[PDB]
Design a protein around this ligand. Structure first.
Ligand SMILES: O=C(N[C@@H](Cc1cc(I)c(Oc2cc(I)c(O)c(I)c2)c(I)c1)C(=O)O)c1ccc2c(c1)C(=O)OC21c2ccc(O)cc2Oc2cc(O)ccc21
Ligand SMILES: [Ca+2]
Lengths: 339, 34
């Protein structure tokens, strides 16, 4: 109810970022956690002031006249809390870690806030040994994602003085699992007009919510997990992927939620894993986060001396879909250097 | 019954119900990409 308006803005941010990725890497796999990316940037905004702060939340899709800064902060705090609330049969955890340089002067308020309100672990980190620091952070992310996100950080700047990381791990079982005895070992999957790859193809005949969107010329299939989560598969008609991508929005999701109807489907779904990485520094800059990178960055709410600025950002996310369910994880990295 | 065969490029969303959050979003073009 109160979360919905925010999650909807978060969804339109997800689709806008998705469309930037389709320009960066056309006709290629895309996979990311929008909630991870949004949550990491809102955390950074908690210590920002003035235009540095407003640029971040506006880039995330918020209108400050509609949703005041304090409301955005409270909302995201409530969102993280709700997502982490234990739900039987569902593994879902989203958390943050702050790796603070030995000589940093973080404000006691910033630290207590993130720890108490934003599921944050704080670690005193010696960045003078940059190789060891990078390994500590990568290993932490690896642990918190149940081993699924390995080597998040490829390079760490030698003058790094703070790193903020967000992680998400998700593991769920299908409401109606596939029988591996009905999985075809090797089936064709079209990757371009003249080329197929072979994948195992799972097969079941069950009642699912589904629709054909008559305007967008795509099939939409909902597959429930056993509690509090679902997967939506969107299968455009031949030649329609670009137009469907253009149309993806919270408005479109609301339309589909009304139109979905449960009935029998003879369903074939591939068993597969993929992984994706994104260097987000320049993308976030293009999207409107400018002052955070500048020599006049205003993070006066974070450290005593306003002594840092954003230098780099990256995301990695992984997916596996099989007969039992789905396991996915992601992590976001934000690097800071002296201002 | 209608057949739905996910045997070519598709988009995928993983949603959490209680908050209506998109946890993951993607497009699968080549499911065997390393
Ligand atoms: O079809 C159902 N609607 C679900 C599925 C759904 C669909 C979509 I699109 C989205 O994304 C989304 C929607 C909206 I509005 C907005 O604004 C955004 I931004 C994104 C989501 I999130 C979810 C829905 O919850 O909206 C459906 C609803 C409920 C159920 C089923 C389908 C179903 O198979 O059984 C239930 C169900 C599901 C899970 C669960 O833990 C319990 C439960 O119980 C009940 C009880 C009743 O009375 C009816 C249905 C179901
Ligand atoms: Ca076989």
């Amino acid at each position: 109810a109160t979360l919905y308006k925010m999650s909807s803005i978060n969804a339109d941010f997800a689709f806008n970022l998705y469309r930037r990725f389709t320009v960066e890497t056309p006709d290629k796999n895309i996979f990311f956690s929008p909630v991870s990316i949004s949550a990491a940037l809102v955390m950074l905004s908690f210590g920002a002031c003035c235009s540095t702060q407003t640029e971040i939340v506006e880039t995330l899709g918020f209108n400050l006249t509609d949703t005041p800064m304090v409301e955005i902060q409270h909302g995201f705090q409530h969102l993280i809390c709700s997502l982490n609330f234990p739900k039987k049969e569902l593994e879902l955890q989203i958390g943050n870690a702050l790796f603070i340089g030995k000589h940093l002067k973080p404000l006691a308020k910033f630290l207590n806030d993130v720890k108490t309100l934003y599921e944050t672990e704080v670690f005193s980190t010696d960045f003078s040994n940059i190789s060891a620091a990078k390994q500590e952070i990568n290993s932490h992310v690896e642990m918190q994602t149940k081993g699924k996100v390995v080597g998040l950080i490829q390079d760490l700047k030698p003058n790094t003085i703070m790193v903020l990381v967000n992680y998400i791990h998700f593991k769920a079982q299908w409401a109606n699992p596939f029988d591996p005895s009905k999985t075809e070992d090797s089936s064709s999957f079209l990757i371009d007009k003249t080329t197929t790859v072979q994948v195992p193809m799972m097969h079941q005949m069950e009642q699912y919510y589904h629709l054909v969107d008559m305007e967008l010329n795509c099939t939409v299939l909902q597959m429930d997990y056993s509690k509090n989560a679902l997967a939506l598969f969107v299968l455009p008609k031949e030649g329609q992927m670009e137009s469907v991508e253009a149309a993806m929005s919270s408005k479109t999701l609301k339309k589909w939620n009304r139109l979905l109807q449960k009935g029998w489907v003879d369903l074939f779904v591939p068993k597969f894993s993929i992984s994706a990485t994104y260097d987000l520094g320049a993308t976030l800059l293009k999207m409107g986060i400018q002052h955070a990178y500048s020599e006049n960055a205003d993070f006066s709410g974070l450290t005593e001396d306003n002594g840092l600025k954003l230098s780099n950002a990256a995301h990695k996310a992984v997916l596996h879909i099989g007969e039992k369910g789905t396991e996915a994880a992601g992590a976001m990295f934000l690097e800071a250097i002296p201002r | 019954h209608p057949i739905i065969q996910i045997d070519r490029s598709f988009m995928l969303l993983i949603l959490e119900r209680s908050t209506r959050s998109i946890l993951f979003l993607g497009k699968v073009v080549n499911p065997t990409e390393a």
